[PDB]
Amino acid sequence: SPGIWQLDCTHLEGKVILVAVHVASGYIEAEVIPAETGQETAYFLLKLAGRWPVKTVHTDNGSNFTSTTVKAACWWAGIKQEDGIPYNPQSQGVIESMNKELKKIIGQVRDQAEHLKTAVQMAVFIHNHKRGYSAGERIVDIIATDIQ
Amino acid sequence: SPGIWQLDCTHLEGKVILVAVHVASGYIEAEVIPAETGQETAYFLLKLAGRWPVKTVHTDNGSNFTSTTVKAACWWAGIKQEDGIPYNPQSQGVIESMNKELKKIIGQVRDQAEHLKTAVQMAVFIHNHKRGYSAGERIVDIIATDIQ
Numbered sequence: 351s352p353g354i355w356q357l358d359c360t361h362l363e364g365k366v367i368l369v370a371v372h373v374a375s376g377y378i379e380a381e382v383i384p385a386e387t388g389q390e391t392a393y394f395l396l397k398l399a400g401r402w403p404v405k406t407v408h409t410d411n412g413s414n415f416t417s418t419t420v421k422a423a424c425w426w427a428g429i430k431q432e433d434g435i436p437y438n439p440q441s442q443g444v445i446e447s448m449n450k451e452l453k454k455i456i457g458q459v460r461d462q463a464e465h466l467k468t469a470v471q472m473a474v475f476i477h478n479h480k481r482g483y484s485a486g487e488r489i490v491d492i493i494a495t496d497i498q
Numbered sequence: 499s500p501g502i503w504q505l506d507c508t509h510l511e512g513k514v515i516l517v518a519v520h521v522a523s524g525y526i527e528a529e530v531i532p533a534e535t536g537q538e539t540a541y542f543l544l545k546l547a548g549r550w551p552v553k554t555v556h557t558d559n560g561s562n563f564t565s566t567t568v569k570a571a572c573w574w575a576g577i578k579q580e581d582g583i584p585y586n587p588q589s590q591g592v593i594e595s596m597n598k599e600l601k602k603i604i605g606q607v608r609d610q611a612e613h614l615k616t617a618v619q620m621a622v623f624i625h626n627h628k629r630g631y632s633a634g635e636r637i638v639d640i641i642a643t644d645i646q
């Protein structure tokens with residue numbers, strides 16, 4: 351559980367926002383990319399796994415699950431690649447709600463930045479800091495407990 | 499101490515590698531940029547502060563310390579901007595040694611990736627995972643102890 355992440359791809363302003371969610375805490379990292387390709391997803395995962403102890407990733411779709419480049423990155427970084435099928439259906443709704451929430455925050459900051467990528471990083475900040483603990487606090491506590 | 503980071507700019511292959519070091523743990527995040535501008539440094543800091551609880555940043559040089567865009571990002575993210583003057587001179591040698599170490603790792607992986615940015619993220623991964631605890635383990639424990 352401390353090492354489980356879920357990928358999530360959402361769209362805004364004709365661009366793609368790729369999100370990784372730490373399932374147990376709700377903590378996220380995100381980036382704007384021109385389109386979801388295997389190469390972009392693979393690079394995003396390499397970044398994520400260098401920053402947090404990523405053991406398992408539930409991939410967001412079958413193309414990324416199949417991608418040889420995504421598979422290469424998961425091999426390189428020691429990540430177990432799994433499907434993202436919500437066997438528990440409350441999983442879908444949780445991600446859906448998060449995408450709506452993230453888009454809301456993006457709208458609230460959009461005018462403070464010229465570029466979407468900046469607004470997305472502002473949204474990541476607000477999401478991870480929002481309080482009762484924050485997602486940032488929860489992920490650190492979960493991983494620290496696991497290390498001990 | 500749990501919230502203190504230091505910026506570090508190093509060069510390779512005609513490109514710029516911007517690094518943030520969590521001083522107490524040795525944990526890093528890094529990116530490749532075409533050149534070190536206020537705008538790039540500001541964006542990097544916004545990303546960092548959304549991901550870790552960044553209280554204080556020792557900026558890497560006077561141009562970034564002065565930059566209105568860097569100041570705007572620090573204001574936005576609640577970061578206290580400080581100079582990076584090594585009043586304690588062992589600070590300079592520590593960063594120097596880390597840049598040499600990072601470049602060594604980059605050379606060891608360079609052939610496994612087409613692009614420098616990829617090699618840098620591989621280097622971040624290896625640096626943060628290297629063991630006795632790793633830098634990734636130390637930063638999590640430090641912040642968790644602080645939260646409690």
Ligand SMILES: CC(C)C[C@H](CNC(=O)Cc1cc[nH]c1)Cc1ccc2c(c1C(=O)O)OCO2
Nearest residue numbers: 461462463464465468537538540541570571574
């Ligand atoms: C920290 C926030 C409050 C401001 C900065 C600077 N932006 C402005 O002042 C433009 C402006 C906004 C309203 N009127 C004029 C945002 C920023 C920082 C770094 C970047 C950016 C951006 C961006 O604008 O997307 O793009 C890539 O690197």
Ligand SMILES: CC(C)C[C@H](CNC(=O)Cc1cc[nH]c1)Cc1ccc2c(c1C(=O)O)OCO2
Nearest residue numbers: 389390392393422423426609610611612613616
């Ligand atoms: C996970 C590692 C082991 C491989 C991947 C895929 N690269 C190759 O297979 C090319 C190759 C290298 C040697 N011979 C053929 C690296 C990678 C992933 C994602 C990216 C990249 C790169 C990159 O190559 O820089 O660039 C931006 O998005």
Ligand SMILES: [Cl-]
Nearest residue numbers: 401402403634
């Ligand atoms: Cl790690």
Ligand SMILES: [Cl-]
Nearest residue numbers: 486549550551
């Ligand atoms: Cl945080």
